[PDB]
Structure 1
Amino acid sequence: ACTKNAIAQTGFNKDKYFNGDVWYVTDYLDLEPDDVPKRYCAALAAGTASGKLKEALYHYDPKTQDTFYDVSELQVESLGKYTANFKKVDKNGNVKVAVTAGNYYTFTVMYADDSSALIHTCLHKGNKDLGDLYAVLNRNKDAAAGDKVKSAVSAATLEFSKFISTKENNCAYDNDSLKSLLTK
């Protein structure tokens, strides 16, 4: 179940966020902690491609090796709040599961700057969801969270100390696949 209406950053800069580069999840927190494994890897590319707002999302259980790529044209609810009906694809963009109305996440950017971000998502796969999931992002795979994003976690009335780190999972990312998936 999702329970939060996350507030987007006032003055969110969409061109900077959706610039075609990769964001790495460095830390995450699910309000239903059993919905996501304690050890998990994720990254996303966010861009505009041929005038469509796009995201390509990767996730990987580092212990089971299960690997997933999703691709979505986003639809806009408000500046910094999006609905992403996704298709499951291989790393090359080949469709494995077509878009279908019930398979979507919402995506809210609570804080962003040039190097870091805090997002909330609510995933739906049919009648089931993955809970409220918050993620700290960085442009650099190994970056410890800085004061700006940690303060944004506090501003959301969350405790960064409770976030789970992804840094000890031996995560590796196909950056090239993520970027090229934006076009698919």
Structure 2
Amino acid sequence: ACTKNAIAQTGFNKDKYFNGDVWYVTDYLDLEPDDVPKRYCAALAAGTASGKLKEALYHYDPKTQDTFYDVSELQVESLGKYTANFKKVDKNGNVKVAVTAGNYYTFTVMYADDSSALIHTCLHKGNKDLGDLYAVLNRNKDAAAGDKVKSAVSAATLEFSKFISTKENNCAYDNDSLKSLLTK
């Protein structure tokens, strides 16, 4: 179940966030912690492609090697708050599971600057959902969370000390696929 109406960043700069580049998840918090593994790798690209607002996602379980990519068109709910219906794709954008009603995530950018961000997502796959998930993002996959984004975590009435880091998993990413998937 999801329980949070995440508040988007005051003054959110959509063109800077959605600039076509890659964001790495460095730390995450699921409010239903058993919904996701305690060791995990994730990243995304975010941009406008031929006028359409898009995200490309990458997930990798470093223990099981379970890997998947997704491509989403985002619809606007309000500035910094989106609903994304996703299709599972291979790294080249070929469809493995088509867009389907009931398969969507909400996405709220609670904080962002040029290098760092805090997001919330509520994932739905049919009638289930994977609890509220918060993620600390960085442009540099090895960046420790700075004071700006940790302050944002506190401003959301969360504690950064409870977030789980992704940094000890030897995560390696295919940035080229994430960028090209934005067009798919």
TM class by shorter chain equals over 0.9
For 2:63 and 2:124, the matched residues in 1 are separated by 24
3-state SS, counterpart of residue 62 of structure 2 = coil
Give, in whole Å, the separation in 2 of the partners of 1:137 and 1:69: 18
CA–CA separation in structure 2 for the residues paired with 1:124 and 1:130: 7
Q: Secondary structure at the match of 1:20?
A: strand
Unaligned runs of 5+ in 2: none
Residue identity (%): 100
Shift of 1:73: 0.6
- Alpha-carbon distance, 1:102 to partner: 0.4
Give the C-alpha shift of residue 113 in structure 1. 0.1
**Partner of residue 87, structure 1:** 87
Q: What's the TM-score, normalizing by structure 1? A: 1.00
1:104-123 matched pairs, under 5 angstroms: 104-123=104-123
How far apart, in 1, do the equivalents of 2:130 and 2:92 lie?
26
- Give the CA deviation at 1:47: 0.2
Q: Shift of the alpha carbon at 1:16? A: 0.1
Q: Deviations over 1:141-181 (max 9, x none)?
A: 00000000000000000000000000001100000000000
CA RMSD of aligned residues (A): 0.3
Gaps in structure 1 of 5+ consecutive residues:
none
1:88 CA displacement: 0.3
Shift of residue 8, structure 1, vs aligned partner: 0.1
1:138 CA displacement: 0.1
In the TM superposition, what is the alpha-carbon distance from 1:126 to its structure 2 partner?
A: 0.6
Distance in 2 (CA, whole Å) between partners of 1:20 and 1:147 is: 25
Task: Provide the secondary structure at the position in 2 that maps to 1:9.
Answer: coil
Q: Equivalences for 1:169-180 in 2 at 5 Å? A: 169-180=169-180
Give a deviation string over 1:59-111, Cα, whole Å, max 9, x none: 11000000010100100000000000000000000000000010000000000
Instruction: Please state whether the residue corresponding to 1:123 is helix, strand or coil.
Output: strand
Name the residue aligned to 2:14.
Answer: 14
Name the SS of the counterpart of 2:177 in structure 1.
Answer: helix
